[PDB]
Swiss-Prot record, chains A, B:
Family, per entry: Belongs to the ExbD/TolR family.
Protein name: Tol-Pal system protein TolR
GO molecular-function terms, A-Z: transmembrane transporter activity
S-S bonds: none
Subunit structure: The Tol-Pal system is composed of five core proteins: the inner membrane proteins TolA, TolQ and TolR, the periplasmic protein TolB and the outer membrane protein Pal. They form a network linking the inner and outer membranes and the peptidoglycan layer.
Protein species of origin: Haemophilus influenzae (strain ATCC 51907 / DSM 11121 / KW20 / Rd)
A biological process from GO: protein transport
Keywords: Cell cycle, Cell division, Cell inner membrane, Cell membrane, Membrane, Transmembrane, Transmembrane helix
Gene behind this protein: tolR
Protein origin, superkingdom: Bacteria
Covered range of the whole protein: 59 to 130 of 139
Membrane topology: Single-pass membrane protein
Functional summary from the UniProt entry: Part of the Tol-Pal system, which plays a role in outer membrane invagination during cell division and is important for maintaining outer membrane integrity.
GO cellular component, one term: plasma membrane
Lineage: Bacteria, Pseudomonadati, Pseudomonadota, Gammaproteobacteria, Pasteurellales
Subcellular location: Cell inner membrane
Amino acid sequence: GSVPVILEVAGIGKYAISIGGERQEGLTEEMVTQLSRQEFDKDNNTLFLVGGAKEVPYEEVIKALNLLHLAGIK
Amino acid sequence: GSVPVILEVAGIGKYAISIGGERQEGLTEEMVTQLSRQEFDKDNNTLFLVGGAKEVPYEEVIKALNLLHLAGIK
């Protein structure tokens, strides 16, 4: 493959997403869902990975993973 | 940066890790910890991200994230 789908937890409610090499910053939770869902519906074998920064609480990372599960990403 | 630290959940107990462009496959949980800890102690600003495959249960992804937290990765 070229480059997976990457979701980054920049803080509290702010996220960044890397789609096949292209990076998008300043995304919201509702918007991150929209994009994640659209990319997964077009490609079913898209490797999904989630990472958080050192300043983000682990509980928020769980929530992020939770949101992805809710939209059927993982 | 060049390329973050990526940990992939290939299944049940099998993991893959990508360190600055170099990918290692067939790693165990105890070994993944060793590597993750060594990379984090050398670089404190290393972006850490975790992703699981479509065939892996979400509960295992939580466990993986849990293991990283235990060794102070996130």
